[PDB]
Amino acid sequence: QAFRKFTKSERSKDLIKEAILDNDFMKNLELSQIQEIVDCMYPVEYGKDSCIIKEGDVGSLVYVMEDGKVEVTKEGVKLCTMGPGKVFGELAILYNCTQTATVKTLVNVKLWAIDRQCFQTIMM
């Protein structure tokens, strides 16, 4: 039952909650689960032109964008761009499978990540 609270700003808590409630796979979580996810999220930064996750890789974190923009690609096609308040990486963890798409930064990016063990603890 791995878990750890990371102290963060009120704006960041609101951003994580908005991202959860905006995603069809996550938006029906109980309030207690939403808060546990908020608490277990920790900050990560990736410089511009950096792959966050690559298609075909095993999942390790669930990500919520905080600042900057990422491009999601598959088979060399831009699927979309993702800015603040968007979740990604949850499917690989929820369905214990590899990443369907690559996510690469277009500019310097800040995001919130939750370790798969903590996400698994909360979903249980």
Residue numbers in the entry: 79 to 202
How does the study describe this entry?
Cyclic GMP-dependent protein kinases (PKGs) are key mediators of the nitric oxide/cyclic guanosine monophosphate (cGMP) signaling pathway that regulates biological functions as diverse as smooth muscle contraction, cardiac function, and axon guidance. The R-domain comprises a leucine zipper (LZ) domain, a linker region with an auto-inhibitory (AI) sequence, and two cyclic nucleotide-binding (CNB-A and -B) domains. By analogy to PKA, the PKG R-domain is thought to bind via its AI sequence to the C-domain active site to form an auto-inhibited R:C state; binding of cGMP to the R-domain destabilizes this state and allows active kinase to phosphorylate downstream substrates.
Since the RQ mutation does not alter folding or prevent adoption of the closed conformation, we propose that the CNB-A sequence is biased to adopt the closed state. Because the PBC of the RQ CNB-A domain makes intermonomer crystal contacts, it is possible that these contacts help stabilize the closed state. We conclude that neither crystal contacts nor interactions with cGMP are needed to drive either the wildtype or mutant domain to the closed state, supporting our hypothesis that PBC-A is biased toward the closed state. Chemical shifts of apo R192Q NH resonances are more similar to those of the cGMP-bound wildtype than to the apo wildtype, consistent with the mutation inducing a similar conformational change as cGMP binding to wildtype.
